[PDB]
Structure formats: structure tokens, C-alpha cells
């Protein structure tokens, strides 16, 4: 599923993330707009071998199981395959793990390089929270 911006604002809302840990619910729809475009089944490869899964593209080598990323853990104990459903439940759930972890939103390099320290409020902006 390919989300829009206001719909997926709201998805996250009723899921909790809106200030969960601090983070702005305009800091998340930035994140996933650079991270997959709004779209659920969104899958990259990285060059150690693990791959980035889903609307948050969630890693691999820490948080889910694929079958293929030898010597990874399963942080969420979740198959990575389910953060590709079009029901965002358990990209969210996983996303509030990793973002307690200690580096805050940081373990996204897209939200560190194109969302950190912009005006990220005018992703929700227009928008019926
Ligand atoms: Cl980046």
C-alpha cells in the first residue's frame, strides 16, 4: 500500500507514536517519506548482505528475521516480511523498540539527514488529526 501524507499522519496517530519519546508526529511522516515514498513494500539491500524492510525500513541485522542475514538478531521477533502489510500495526510497534533503544531517531539516516532540524510540523500541516 502507497500511503497519502494525511493518512498516514493519522494511521500513526492512533498507533501512539504521536510524541512517543519526545519525536513530533511530523518527525515520523518525514521519516517514512524518505525513507520508502509512503509505501509499505518497500525492500533495499545492504551491502554487508541485510536488508531494510517496509514503511520505516527497519534493518535486518537487528530487528527482524529473513531467512538470509547469518548471525543477525530478531529484536522485534517478528519475519521482516510482515513489515511489508498494508496494516502499518507491526512497522510501529518494531519503530517504538528501536526508537527507545538509546539513539533516538538517529538509527534513521534518512530522518537524520533530511528531517532533524528542518520545520517538520509542516508534514502534518492541512492535515485532520
Ligand atoms: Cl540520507
Redesign the pocket.
Known amino acids: 500500500k502507497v500511503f497519502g501524507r494525511c493518512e498516514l499522519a493519522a494511521a500513526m496517530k492512533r498507533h501512539g507514536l504521536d510524541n512517543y519519546r519526545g519525536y513530533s508526529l511530523g518527525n515520523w511522516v518525514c521519516a517514512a517519506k524518505?525513507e520508502s515514498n509512503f509505501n509499505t513494500q518497500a525492500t533495499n539491500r545492504n551491502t554487508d548482505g541485510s536488508t531494510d524492510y517496509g514503511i520505516l525500513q527497519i534493518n535486518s541485522r537487528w530487528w527482524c528475521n529473513d531467512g538470509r542475514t547469518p548471525g543477525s538478531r530478531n529484536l522485534c521477533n517478528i519475519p521482516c516480511s510482515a513489515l511489508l502489510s498494508s496494516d502499518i500495526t507491526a512497522s510501529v510497534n518494531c519503530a517504538k523498540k528501536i526508537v527507545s533503544d538509546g539513539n533516538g531517531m538517529n538509527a534513521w539516516?534518512?530522518w537524520?539527514?533530511?528531517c532533524k532540524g528542518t520545520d517538520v510540523q509542516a508534514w502534518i500541516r492541512g492535515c485532520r488529526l
Open positions: 524518505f539516516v534518512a537524520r539527514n533530511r
